[PDB]
């Protein structure tokens, strides 16, 4: 990925993250050098398109708010905040057409640094997805990527009678544009009552290993069965820990190409010195109705394929299956068996839009 990640701060204030050049004006408490025990953020921005344009970054603060879900009772069997989770909390959210990131950090009070004036932080929760916009085919199951990483509190170890990586939760809220619901919500590793399964989707969510004291990285790949374009749109994926939670956004769209129709397609003669009948031009799906361009052209004489056609035309504009009409003028001694063409430019279509033709005599 890029060397530096510039960013904004509200809840604007400019800042930057470093995965150094002098930066005197930026607040020494807003320019962060990121420490990574798990290498998740580091080796994940390493396997990142370096040199890509500026993604969408945003920084803010946070306080460990437990999950409001009553089933989450079990990960938090006591309403006391841990001692090693004091100080400041920072949450950074980044979005890009390659990977989406949500990270938690705990910096230091003094930004004083003897080499160069910069600040050190440390990542306690990493969330990174490499599928920010899948496009699955109609009638086949859908797989989604979502990795995370939780570093244990480097200090608290002389009191925990149950060492090792603690459990965690994964929650995917999904679909039904114009409304909202929940599809997945499961905390594997806890003898607690889990909710039902809507549509029957599940996720592979666990740890990659089981090293007791070092950092931890975990997989959380979602899996939906046979999908249908009534589930298209947006969804949110969140990873949960005691008092902690981190969410990212994902989008999904489907593809269906259009087809053409151009009547009258084939006709019989039309005596010389006579205007041919009312010709038409129609398209199937194109929406909405902003920026639509309509062109009528005579193709069967002199002047190339870009002439302001003679005769009368007809354009128009919860969308449109437009019906352009055309009344061509009488013919000359140069348009025997000529043709007429109609061109529709719409943002959804290619830059050529859609062309249709009608043969004359």
């Amino acid at each position: 990925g890029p060397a530096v990640i510039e960013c904004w701060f509200v809840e604007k204030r400019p800042g930057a993250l470093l995965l150094p050049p002098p930066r005197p004006d930026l607040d020494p408490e807003l320019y962060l050098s990121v420490h990574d025990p798990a290498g998740a953020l580091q080796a994940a921005f390493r396997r990142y398109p370096r040199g890509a344009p500026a993604p969408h970054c945003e920084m803010s603060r946070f306080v460990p708010l437990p999950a409001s879900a009553k089933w989450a009772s079990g990960l938090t069997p006591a309403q006391n905040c841990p001692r090693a989770l004091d100080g400041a909390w920072l949450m950074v959210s980044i979005s890009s057409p390659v990977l989406s990131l949500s990270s938690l950090l705990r910096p230091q009070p003094e930004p004083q640094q003897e080499p160069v004036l910069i600040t050190m932080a440390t990542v306690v929760l990493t969330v990174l997805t490499h599928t920010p916009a899948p496009r699955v085919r109609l009638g086949q199951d859908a797989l989604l990527d979502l990795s995370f990483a939780y570093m244990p509190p480097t200090s608290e170890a002389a009191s925990s009678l149950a060492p090792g990586p603690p459990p965690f939760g994964l929650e995917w809220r999904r679909q039904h544009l114009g409304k909202g619901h929940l599809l997945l919500a499961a905390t594997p590793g806890l003898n607690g009552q889990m909710p039902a399964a809507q549509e029957g989707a599940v996720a592979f969510a666990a740890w990659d290993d089981d090293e007791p004291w070092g950092p931890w990285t975990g997989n959380g790949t979602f899996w939906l069965p046979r999908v249908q374009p009534f589930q298209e749109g947006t969804y949110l994926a969140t990873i949960h820990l005691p008092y902690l939670q981190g969410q990212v956004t994902l989008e999904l769209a489907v593809y269906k190409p259009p087809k053409v129709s151009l009547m009258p397609a084939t006709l019989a003669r039309a005596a010389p010195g006579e205007a041919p009948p009312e010709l038409l031009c129609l398209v199937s799906h194109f929406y909405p109705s902003g920026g639509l361009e309509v062109e009528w052209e005579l193709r069967g004489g002199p002047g190339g394929r870009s002439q302001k056609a003679e005769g009368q035309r007809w354009l128009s504009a919860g969308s449109v299956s437009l019906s352009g009409h055309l009344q061509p003028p009488p013919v000359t001694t140069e348009q025997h068996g000529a043709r007429y063409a109609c061109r529709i430019h719409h943002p959804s279509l290619p830059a050529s839009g859609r062309s249709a033709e009608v043969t004359l005599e």
């Binding site: 109705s289 009368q312 504009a317 449109v320 009409h325």
Partner: protein, 88 residues
Amino acid sequence: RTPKIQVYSRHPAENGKSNFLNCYVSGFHPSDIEVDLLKNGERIEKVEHSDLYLLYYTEFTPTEKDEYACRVNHVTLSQPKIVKWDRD
């Protein structure tokens, strides 16, 4: 939401006789929208709206060289939109 604006007639238009010119605007918010009509570029009077988005209409006598149009100004439109006269 940008409005759908179809400028049609009530009967197949002829030259020399009178007919209706109907600018059907729909699908947007708010209810108030600056929907006017032009004749040769000049803001005409007489433009109807529906009762309590829907159809606007008037009557005219279509001819050869004269030209009508429907001007629409909605808050999404940074500048107004001129839908051209259409007979066929």
